[PDB]
Each structure stands twice: as C-alpha cells, then as structure tokens.
Design an enzyme around this catalytic site. Structure first.
Site, mmCIF file in Angstrom:
data_model
loop_
_atom_site.group_PDB
_atom_site.id
_atom_site.type_symbol
_atom_site.label_atom_id
_atom_site.label_comp_id
_atom_site.label_asym_id
_atom_site.label_seq_id
_atom_site.Cartn_x
_atom_site.Cartn_y
_atom_site.Cartn_z
ATOM 1 N NE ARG A 7 -3.453 2.456 2.612
ATOM 2 C CZ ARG A 7 -4.252 2.770 3.625
ATOM 3 N NH1 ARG A 7 -4.318 1.981 4.688
ATOM 4 N NH2 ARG A 7 -4.982 3.875 3.574
ATOM 5 C CG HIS A 8 -0.156 4.659 -2.201
ATOM 6 N ND1 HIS A 8 -0.518 5.599 -1.263
ATOM 7 C CD2 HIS A 8 -1.267 4.417 -2.938
ATOM 8 C CE1 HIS A 8 -1.790 5.916 -1.424
ATOM 9 N NE2 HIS A 8 -2.268 5.213 -2.435
ATOM 10 N N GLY A 9 2.714 4.954 0.286
ATOM 11 C CA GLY A 9 2.851 5.837 1.426
ATOM 12 C C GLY A 9 1.723 6.844 1.479
ATOM 13 C CD1 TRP A 13 -6.671 15.415 0.191
ATOM 14 C CD2 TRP A 13 -7.681 14.165 -1.373
ATOM 15 N NE1 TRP A 13 -7.237 16.267 -0.724
ATOM 16 C CE2 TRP A 13 -7.862 15.530 -1.694
ATOM 17 C CE3 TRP A 13 -8.233 13.195 -2.218
ATOM 18 C CZ2 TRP A 13 -8.570 15.948 -2.827
ATOM 19 C CZ3 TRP A 13 -8.937 13.611 -3.347
ATOM 20 C CH2 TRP A 13 -9.098 14.978 -3.638
ATOM 21 C CG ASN A 14 -3.621 8.456 5.377
ATOM 22 O OD1 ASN A 14 -4.422 7.520 5.311
ATOM 23 N ND2 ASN A 14 -2.717 8.558 6.345
ATOM 24 N N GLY A 21 -9.007 8.405 -5.048
ATOM 25 C CA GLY A 21 -9.039 7.371 -6.067
ATOM 26 C C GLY A 21 -8.076 7.685 -7.194
ATOM 27 C CD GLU A 74 -8.201 2.667 -3.752
ATOM 28 O OE1 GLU A 74 -7.365 2.569 -2.829
ATOM 29 O OE2 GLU A 74 -9.091 1.827 -3.962
ATOM 30 C CG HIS A 76 -12.896 6.733 -11.395
ATOM 31 N ND1 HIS A 76 -13.499 6.914 -12.620
ATOM 32 C CD2 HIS A 76 -12.709 7.971 -10.880
ATOM 33 C CE1 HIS A 76 -13.677 8.206 -12.834
ATOM 34 N NE2 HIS A 76 -13.206 8.869 -11.793
ATOM 35 N N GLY A 134 -4.664 1.095 -1.118
ATOM 36 C CA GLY A 134 -5.446 0.475 -0.057
ATOM 37 C C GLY A 134 -6.647 -0.334 -0.525
#
Length: 171
Positions: A7-9, A13-14, A21, A74, A76, A134
């Site tokens: 799962r990317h860093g 927006w996290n 998306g 991810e 859309h 994710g």
C-alpha cells in the site's frame, strides 16, 4: 502464486480523511519516509506498480524500477473523489465499509473494480511485488476472507488465490 502487495505511502488526503481514487496526489514527506523504510524489506522480485504518482514514487523509494499498469489503480470514486469520509452519505459509507454494492456516479462500481484487479492478478505468471493502493490490498484480503485494512506504506504477502501469508508493517 506468491504475490507481495504494497500500500503506497501516505498523502495529505490520508490525514484529512478524504476519498482518494484517481486524483493524482503526491506523497507527503512522511509518505516518502514510509516508502524508504520498505527498501530491503521487500523481496527482490519483478515489480509492477499503479501508474499513479503516489504508487510509483513509493516503488522508486523502495528501490524498485516497476513496470506501470493502470489496472493496479485504486478504485475510481467518480463524483466522490475527494469527499470527506465523515460526511459521505450513509449508503456509500455502508457500501464501502461492507465492501459491497458501491456504485458511485461517474466512477467505478466495486464489482468493476474487483474484475479489473483480479483479472490483472490472473495474468501474473511468476511471483512479483505489486505497488498499489489500499482499496486493491483490501479487495485481495477480503477475497481471502480477511479484513483488508493495512497501514499506508505497509505490505502483505499472499498465496493467490488461496491464503494470506504475512502482513508486514514497519515503524
């Protein structure tokens, strides 16, 4: 088939709790730090990555030179791109929480997302490391009967399509 999904860093927006998306945001400083911590932890296997910036930047900092595939993107979110989770209509919240019956206007349904992801996985003919998102990791974990929630910059290895092998997280 042994597959390692990353799962990317994290991106802004996290922390802000907004649906991310196909909106192409960059990693935050911490997101890059998380990516660098993956270097040496992942096996030296062929690498594939979503073409979105946050994903292939994670692959780069992790020490890989992946081939890019939009199929690893991810989901859309359509009109829901950037929506605060907090204020999302209960029907969408439930659809996403239960991971079923999600039909965002102008976007991808969860059914289409799963078909896309699983079709891509079926085409893999050897073990590989997949830099993705994710939602993709969740789709795989849930199809294997497990909660698909893993921290940003973390990874999971599975024997697709049979079982989860290990969930890796670094600090």
């Amino acid at each position: 088939m042994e597959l390692w999904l990353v799962r990317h860093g994290e991106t802004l927006w996290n922390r802000e709790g907004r649906l991310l998306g196909w909106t192409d945001l960059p990693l935050t400083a911490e997101g890059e730090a998380q990516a660098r911590r993956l270097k040496g932890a992942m096996p030296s296997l062929p690498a594939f990555s979503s073409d979105l910036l946050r994903a292939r930047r994670t692959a780069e900092l992790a020490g890989f030179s992946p081939r890019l595939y939009p199929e690893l993107r991810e989901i859309h979110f359509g009109a829901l791109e950037g929506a605060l989770w907090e204020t999302l209509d209960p029907r969408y919240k439930e659809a996403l929480l239960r991971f079923q019956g999600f039909h965002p206007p102008g976007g991808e349904s969860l059914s289409a997302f799963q078909e896309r992801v699983f079709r891509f996985l079926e085409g893999l003919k050897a073990p590989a490391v997949l830099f993705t998102h994710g939602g993709v990791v969740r789709a795989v974990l849930r199809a294997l009967g497990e909660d698909g929630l893993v921290p940003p910059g973390s990874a999971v290895a599975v024997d697709w399509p049979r079982r989860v092998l290990v969930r890796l997280a670094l600090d």
